[model samples]
Target: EVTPIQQLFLIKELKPGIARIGVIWDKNAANRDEVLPQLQRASAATGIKVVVAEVASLQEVAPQFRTLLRDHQVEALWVLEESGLLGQAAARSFLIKNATQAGMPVFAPSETWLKEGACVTWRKDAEGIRLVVNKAVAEAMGITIPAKYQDRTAFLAM
Candidate 1:
């Protein structure tokens, strides 16, 4: 289940910019229909646009993903962790490299994708992300993190 707060945070993180989140799925995958709505909710919560694309099979992933890149409007590509297309490390690595070559950020729901060069990931521990928040501290010296966020997580580099 996608939490509203997580969705909000994602929007906040990507905001002040337009981001098109790509959802890749197998046309034959049974549960994709069910999952799409959940992703849509996250998209709505974040004010990001959700772009749905289908791959006929794992073999089609590379070509299909290239189309998203060619569109020129997509800023981020979000792929399901369980998608059979990315189940193979080699395929994931290829996709990551291709996305990097295109200068687009890839957002993966699973940590495995991180090892492939995903720019920002949501799977990190709260403290891990907090370490990167020190820049916020420096930028907003007088501003304080909300107690709610601080209490639940440690700020990075603090």
Candidate 2:
């Protein structure tokens, strides 16, 4: 599985100066104890803040997104794979809609989300991680994949 620290690194790799990102999860979110602390460490190491919105259900998705966008002023959104609630289509749609409207990109956990407006996706396997980029979204966000990640990046048809 892709660790939270690696996720943040990929965000930085995709877009520089992304100082803050919004994340949504539920009480049943997995790996909270393991992920949150690592996220905090990554924040300290990269100086990129992780703003989280813990929701009880899908109904709160929109409201939390509003807070993340309007209040926290996050530069991007991160869709956590460990969160079953966030994995739902409804929650993802709301997040993607608000983020697209705000001109912010999203870091999704799977390539399937690329068609749903996510800018980048990372999938893990026994060997390593595979990165998928939504070319249209990345171009729209003015993000250029660095030379090092060029060979590792797969583009989705837009």
Candidate 3:
């Protein structure tokens, strides 16, 4: 079986000057118990710090986002594989908009998130996907994905 690349390493390689990362996750998301530690440990190899906020339900979203906003040190955001957060249309939009409004880039976790407005991919595929920021989508959010050291993917784009 192929293990996914450590996200911290991937982010380090893809994002320039990313020292601090913020994450939004659902408490019951897949492998939820391990996600936080995984990020904390993985970040060690790349020397990055992660700050995470978990919402028990979709209703807790804006409240949580409001809290994360006060953290001035967050430089980038990576959404977790949380269905509660991404499964619903409203919840997904709320996350992308607020994260971007704060002037930090958001690494979208999947295709729905991408089409909705995630600037990049939160993770990679062992099969055939090359993670990247979508050109048109990034334009909509006012974020430019620098191609310097990034591999771009457009699973939802034609």
Model 3 RMSD to the real structure? 3.5
lDDT of 2 by residue, 1-158 (tens): 77888888878878888899888767687678887778789888878999888787888888888998888989988877734777688877878888889988988877667888898887777657778888888888987676776677888986
TM-score of each: 0.65, 0.90, 0.78
**For every candidate structure, what is the RMSD over all alpha carbons to the true structure, in angstroms?**
6.5, 1.8, 3.5
| Residue-wise C-alpha lDDT for candidate 3, range 1-158, written one tens digit per residue | 11223555666655676788877778778786566677777677678788788888778989877777685468777776746656788888888788777776677666677776676674435653466566675666455344643454444572
lDDT of 3: 0.67
**Which candidate would rank higher by TM-score, 2 or 3?**
2
Over 4-38, each residue of candidate 1 has an lDDT whose tens digit, in order, gives: 33633553453236467666666765576667777
Off by over 4 Å in 1: 1-16, 28-30, 123-158
Q: Model 1 TM-score? A: 0.65
lDDT winner between 2 and 3, please give it.
Answer: 2
The deviation in Å at residue 51 for candidate 3 is 0.6
Q: Please report the TM-score between candidate 3 and the true structure.
A: 0.78
Instruction: Give the candidate order by descending TM-score.
Output: 2, 3, 1
